[PDB]
Amino acid sequence: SDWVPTGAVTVRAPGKVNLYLAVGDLYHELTTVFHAVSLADDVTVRDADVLSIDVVGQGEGTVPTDERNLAWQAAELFADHVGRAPDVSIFINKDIPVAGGMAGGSADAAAVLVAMNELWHAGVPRRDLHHLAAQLGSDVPFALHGGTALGTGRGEQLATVLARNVFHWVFAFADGGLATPQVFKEIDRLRENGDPPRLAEADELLGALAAGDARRLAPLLGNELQAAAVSLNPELRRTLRAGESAGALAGIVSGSGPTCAFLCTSADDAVQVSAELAGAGVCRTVRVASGPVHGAQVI
Numbered sequence: 015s016d017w018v019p020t021g022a023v024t025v026r027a028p029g030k031v032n033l034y035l036a037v038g039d040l041y042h043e044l045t046t047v048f049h050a051v052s053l054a055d056d057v058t059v060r061d062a063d064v065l066s067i068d069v070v071g072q073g074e075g076t077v078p079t080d081e082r083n084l085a086w087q088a089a090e091l092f093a094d095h096v097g098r099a100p101d102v103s104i105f106i107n108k109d110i111p112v113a114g115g116m117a118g119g120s121a122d123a124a125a126v127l128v129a130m131n132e133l134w135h136a137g138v139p140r141r142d143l144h145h146l147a148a149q150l151g152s153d154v155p156f157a158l159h160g161g162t163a164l165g166t167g168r169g170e171q172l173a174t175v176l177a178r179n180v181f182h183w184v185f186a187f188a189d190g191g192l193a194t195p196q197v198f199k200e201i202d203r204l205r206e207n208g209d210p211p212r213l214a215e216a217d218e219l220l221g222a223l224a225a226g227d228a229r230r231l232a233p234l235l236g237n238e239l240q241a242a243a244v245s246l247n248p249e250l251r252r253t254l255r256a257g258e259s260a261g262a263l264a265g266i267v268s269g270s271g272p273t274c275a276f277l278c279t280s281a282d283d284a285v286q287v288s289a290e291l292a293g294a295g296v297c298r299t300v301r302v303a304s305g306p307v308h309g310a311q312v313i
């Protein structure tokens with residue numbers, strides 16, 4: 015169903031959820047376990063007379079089509095790297111929520127890097143694409159990488175980890191969005207203010223992933239940005255509680271929010287959870303997905 019015209023390159027790049035997200039000091043130092051899921055954007059790139067961006071799907075109305083778009087920035091950076099003008103049209107069919115904590119703009123940017131490399135057969139190796147991604151944004155490297163990975167530094171340095179099963183997810187999109195800088199500002203505010211708990215080390219969580227054990231994983235999920243996202247959007251507490259009472263093993267805010275993610279034991283539980291959330295009047299719209307999935311790849 016992807017747009018794949020002759021001459022074009024179409025690339026699918028996944029959204030993410032942070033299974034584990036510890037936030038340090040003052041970019042912020044991060045330790046995170048990224049997990050790529052089957053809610054993805056598909057990006058079709060063609061040679062054209064000028065650089066352009068068109069969007070359908072999530073944010074059809076509102077995602078900018080100019081220099082504000084991370085995909086614009088990606089095309090310019092890649093063109094410069096290989097010594098060509100960025101004369102491509104970019105079409106983004108988005109399932110990843112806008113400003114929702116699943117790094118959809120980052121997916122779009124990673125997809126453009128991959129699509130252009132193929133379109134022009136530029137021979138840019140994966141390590142060089144990684145460097146370009148890191149220049150673009152903190153979550154772009156993971157969008158290239160996919161699977162499940164331990165991100166350090168500010169998230170750009172990645173060590174793959176084993177997630178030895180298919181993991182079943184429900185995502186609850188919020189009515190609006192959050193600006194990730196606002197959410198980082200808020201966690202700093204919360205910490206000026208009190209001395210709330212920090213996550214344990216990621217050891218146990220990584221062990222549960224390596225065992226492929228969702229029931230063990232669930233109570234170990236955690237995201238230090240969640241308190242900031244819920245401080246800003248208190249209604250998220252209703253969404254989380256609803257998903258949990260519907261049968262999710264655990265609910266967590268995804269990244270800087272406001273999307274909520276719910277880990278379920280099985281496909282059938284994700285069926286139940288998504289159906290009840292949709293019926294509970296606590297979020298905008300509901301999605302079912304699985305992970306892990308691949309990083310940005312040509313279709």
Ligand SMILES: Nc1ncnc2c1ncn2[C@@H]1O[C@H](COP(=O)(O)OP(=O)(O)OP(=O)(O)O)[C@@H](O)[C@H]1O
Binds near residue numbers: 076077
């Ligand atoms: N390709 C794009 N898709 C969506 N938003 C984009 C894109 N390019 C630029 N933007 C702008 O970026 C912001 C939203 O980015 P995005 O949807 O990636 O947020 P996010 O998923 O919460 O990101 P993260 O979780 O990586 O911090 C908005 O300010 C939006 O106008």
